[PDB]
Design an enzyme around this catalytic site. Sequence first.
Site, PDB file in Angstrom:
ATOM      1  N   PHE A 258      -3.915  -0.174 -12.641  1.00 27.15           N
ATOM      2  CA  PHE A 258      -3.034  -0.799 -11.663  1.00 27.15           C
ATOM      3  C   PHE A 258      -3.118  -0.083 -10.321  1.00 27.15           C
ATOM      4  CE2 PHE A 258       1.221  -1.576  -9.793  1.00 27.15           C
ATOM      5  CZ  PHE A 258       1.150  -2.953  -9.705  1.00 27.15           C
TER       6      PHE A 258
ATOM      7  N   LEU B  40      -6.459  -1.209  -8.782  1.00 28.80           N
ATOM      8  CA  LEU B  40      -6.406  -2.541  -8.188  1.00 28.80           C
ATOM      9  C   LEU B  40      -5.518  -2.567  -6.949  1.00 28.80           C
ATOM     10  CD1 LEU B  40      -3.481  -4.217  -9.098  1.00 28.80           C
ATOM     11  CD2 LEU B  40      -4.701  -4.236 -11.290  1.00 28.80           C
ATOM     12  N   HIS B  41      -4.482  -1.723  -6.898  1.00 31.68           N
ATOM     13  CA  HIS B  41      -3.709  -1.582  -5.667  1.00 31.68           C
ATOM     14  C   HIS B  41      -4.572  -1.054  -4.528  1.00 31.68           C
ATOM     15  CE1 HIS B  41      -1.054   0.433  -2.751  1.00 31.68           C
ATOM     16  NE2 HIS B  41      -0.201  -0.535  -3.034  1.00 31.68           N
ATOM     17  N   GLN B  42      -5.387  -0.031  -4.799  1.00 31.31           N
ATOM     18  CA  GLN B  42      -6.284   0.486  -3.768  1.00 31.31           C
ATOM     19  C   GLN B  42      -7.313  -0.564  -3.358  1.00 31.31           C
ATOM     20  OE1 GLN B  42      -5.160   4.072  -3.711  1.00 31.31           O
ATOM     21  NE2 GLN B  42      -5.456   3.454  -1.573  1.00 31.31           N
TER      22      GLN B  42
END
Length: 187
Positions: A25, A28-30
């Site tokens: 997570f 995917l945020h980065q």
Amino acid sequence: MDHYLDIRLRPDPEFPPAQLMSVLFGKLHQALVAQGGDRIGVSFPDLDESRSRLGERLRIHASADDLRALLARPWLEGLRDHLQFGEPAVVPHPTPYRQVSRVQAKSNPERLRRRLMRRHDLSEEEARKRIPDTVARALDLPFVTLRSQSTGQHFRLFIRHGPLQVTAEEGGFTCYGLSKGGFVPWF
RNA sequence: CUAAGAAAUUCACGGCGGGCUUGAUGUCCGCGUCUACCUGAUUCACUGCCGUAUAGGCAG
């Protein structure tokens, strides 16, 4: 928004799936911060509300161009040993829609005491009497523990799935994939 | 329907004077404690901001 990509968690002989979920997570945020855009929706296909379990499967919702932009980003390196990556298939047409929202909490009274010190210039005992220690907010919601590059403090982010609707309107999406008014299909 | 059923022990009180326990003493030879381990499970419920707000949201 018509497409989706499904990520399954391979069982891991060294790690429980919760910290693997947190790591992916954060990745995917980065990836979404680097890529940009406000049309990326998250989903938990096997979210259990009985014990607030995150689940062992992940579904990310985006358009075809957004999905190929995400998979073109090299964030996927270093994490293939624990996940599955399917195909950007079109979501089923007869699917109920639900929303995802990040529900934060004021679990620490001393943060708000410091805040009111910066807002009303009150003393220590004034904030202690005004704010008791029992105002901590306990949430029975699934969560992920992450630390940020901007601020190294480890923050807990709760994810809650909204009620099932019959239709969805246009809305935005945050950097975490959480909806600020949008919806994701359920199937 | 119980070896069933019943019940006031209690008033008062000076224990103390005295005393040398001391003499002597070799504990001791010998000894393989090994082998094999993920502390970590979401175990940092944290920092800041909008709001008078403890009511309630938002930011990485």
